[PDB]
């Protein structure tokens, strides 16, 4: 039953999908630097500092992911907008798997 109006919603969802990709890239960059940092030529106080810099950066990643979530949470999708509904659902769950990732890094660095 593909309508003009669902197209608006699908385009919103795709711009949100790309935002997500930017943040996920930020998370990938975080993880890569982290693995590098636990390569201790640095003194332990300093490695610690650097790990807290990383922790503040995961916090911002969590935060940006949460702001996306709040935005998607503004959508009202009719039952028959099956296509957007499905894209909205996959995007929410993708973010939450990314959030779980950030919790893993964050729970584990700068306690």
């Amino acid at each position: 039953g593909n309508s003009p109006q669902e197209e608006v919603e699908l385009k919103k969802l795709k711009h949100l999908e790309k935002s997500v990709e930017k943040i996920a890239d930020q998370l990938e960059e975080l993880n890569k630097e982290l693995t590098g940092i636990q390569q201790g030529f640095l003194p332990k106080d300093l490695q610690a500092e650097a790990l807290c810099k990383l922790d503040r950066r995961v916090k911002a990643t969590i935060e940006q992911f949460m702001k996306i979530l709040e935005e998607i949470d503004t959508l009202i999708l009719p039952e028959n907008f099956k296509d957007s509904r499905l894209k909205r659902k996959g995007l929410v769950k993708k973010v939450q798997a990314f959030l779980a990732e950030c919790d893993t890094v964050e729970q584990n660095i700068c306690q």
């Binding site: 979530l69 709040e70 659902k89 929410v92």
Partner: protein, 377 residues
């Protein structure tokens, strides 16, 4: 060029009277109000939206609510009370609070008005970015209940920020000015100003004769506002999730946040339509939460809080020695006054009497400040 500035507790606002009309000025983000927030960084100082946006990454170097401290002594009942709810450091420098933080890693502290001068530097900059001109002259407003030291520490914030503060005008006076209540002609007029925002509630009764203002009394509730309505919705929806799903979301901070945000936005929708729908996919344990709320349900949740905004009103009439019959004008300010039920409780307390509300209740104070500053310049 002369601006009016509403230096609000949570939000600030700057207008300029130009071309026969006040223009409320949007910031670099397009927001017609700006968060009264400053954050302290490894590299930079952030003010306004930038600062509010990162009150998670850096909550120890992010300061708000410095209007609750400005001009007050460290042992002021108020500086003690609010202090417990502030992740930032409040230290005692010789009986008067300085805010302590880390900034480019060197440790730094500020009295409340250096911090409020920062907010006013933003508000000045916001105006200069819009006008493409230097802005030095300003009226700054304060609450009517501000003492001498609170007014003067405010004035000084403006001066440090590089403002020629033409006048410190009371918030409910500036909102009366907004509605040109002072250009009316006849006998002495009693004005009730009803100001309910996100976090505070202030009632003020002024008399105005011959364009001259006098504050008669002041009341309110320091911690009643729109946030309290958001809570009532949140508990209502948390109980609903428990009923349908046998899950308790309330220990999941990110669910609770998703719900709260959707609650506050649903509340806004309910000020101009009689029902609000919410869909949150995957709210808790992967469970979608789709729901709606009527306006009457919203009101019912809030029935005691709304009615109760009337107690400060009666307290205010009493202290001014007026009967509700002797009030000529009622002025609404603060974004929460948008709620049709509050308008109706109040407009039926004053036996069918109407209300000055046509001006955006978040912008009315800056509006009157701007009209004032143009007269004074």
């Amino acid at each position: 060029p002369a601006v009016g500035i509403d230096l609000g507790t949570t939000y600030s606002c700057v207008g300029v009277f130009q071309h026969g009309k006040v223009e409320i000025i949007a910031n670099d983000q397009g927001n017609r109000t700006t968060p009264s927030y400053v954050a302290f960084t490894d590299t930079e100082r952030l003010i306004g939206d930038a600062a509010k946006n990162q009150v998670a990454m850096n909550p120890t170097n992010t300061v708000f609510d410095a209007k609750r401290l400005i001009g007050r002594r460290f042992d002021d009942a108020v500086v003690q009370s609010d202090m417990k709810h502030w992740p930032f450091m409040v230290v005692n420098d010789a009986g008067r609070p300085k805010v302590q933080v880390e900034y480019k890693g060197e440790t730094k502290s500020f009295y409340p008005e250096e911090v409020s001068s920062m907010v006013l530097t933003k508000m000045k900059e916001i105006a200069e970015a819009y006008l493409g001109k230097t802005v030095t002259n300003a009226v700054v407003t304060v609450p009517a209940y501000f003492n001498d030291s609170q007014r003067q520490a405010t004035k000084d914030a403006g001066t440090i920020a590089g403002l020629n503060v033409l006048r410190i005008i009371n918030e409910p006076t500036a909102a009366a000015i907004a509605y040109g209540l002072d250009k009316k002609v006849g006998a002495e007029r009693n004005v009730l100003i009803f100001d309910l925002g996100g976090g505070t509630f202030d009632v003020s009764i002024l008399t105005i004769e011959d364009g001259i203002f006098e504050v008669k009394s002041t009341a309110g509730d320091t911690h009643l506002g729109g946030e309290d309505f958001d809570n009532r919705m949140v508990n209502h929806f948390i109980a609903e999730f428990k009923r349908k799903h046998k899950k308790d979301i309330s220990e999941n901070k990110r669910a609770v946040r998703r719900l709260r945000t959707a609650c506050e936005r649903a509340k806004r929708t309910l000020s101009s339509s009689t029902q609000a729908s919410i869909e949150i996919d995957s709210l808790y344990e992967g469970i979608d939460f789709y729901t709606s709320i009527t306006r009457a349900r919203f009101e019912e949740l809030n029935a005691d809080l709304f009615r109760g905004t009337l107690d400060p009103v009666e307290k205010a009439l009493r202290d001014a020695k007026l009967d509700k019959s002797q009030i000529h004008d009622i002025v609404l300010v603060g974004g929460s006054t948008r709620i049709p039920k509050i308008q109706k409780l109040l407009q039926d307390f004053f036996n069918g009497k109407e209300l000055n509300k046509s001006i955006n209740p978040d912008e009315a104070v800056a509006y009157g400040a701007a009209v004032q500053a143009a007269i004074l310049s």
